[PDB]
Amino acid sequence: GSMATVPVYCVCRLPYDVTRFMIECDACKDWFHGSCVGVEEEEAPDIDIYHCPNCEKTHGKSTLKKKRTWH
């Protein structure tokens, strides 16, 4: 009921909002609002391995896809 827990995500620690774009960090498996971590929805299809700003420090920077599906 009203006292149920809800999952929270991102650096902002908010529950999910379907109107906002999010990307998963491949390392910590948390999810991040593009607006919170500087990733545009339209740029994300080019990201291969996404690492959040915290995970970057030990797991390395995000990588880009070397090939893409057109169509």
């Binding site: 379907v18 906002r20 999010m22 990307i23 929805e41 994300a44 391995i49 996404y50 995000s62």
Partner: peptide
């Protein structure tokens, strides 16, 4: 990457 679209 895995994403959640709008």
């Amino acid at each position: 990457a895995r994403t959640k679209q709008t």
